């Protein structure tokens, strides 16, 4: 799965 | 089927 913050984004 | 918890929000 991916999970996105704010303008940034990150995986696991 | 993806959740929102804040700022930040994951999809899978």
Same mark, same amino acid.
């Given at each position: 799965?991916?999970? &996105?913050?704010?303008?940034?984004? &990150?995986?696991? | %089927?993806?959740? %929102?918890?804040?700022?930040?929000?994951?999809?899978?």
């Amino acid at each position: 799965a991916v999970c &996105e913050c704010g303008p940034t984004r &990150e995986c696991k | %089927e993806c959740r %929102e918890y804040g700022p930040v929000k994951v999809v899978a």
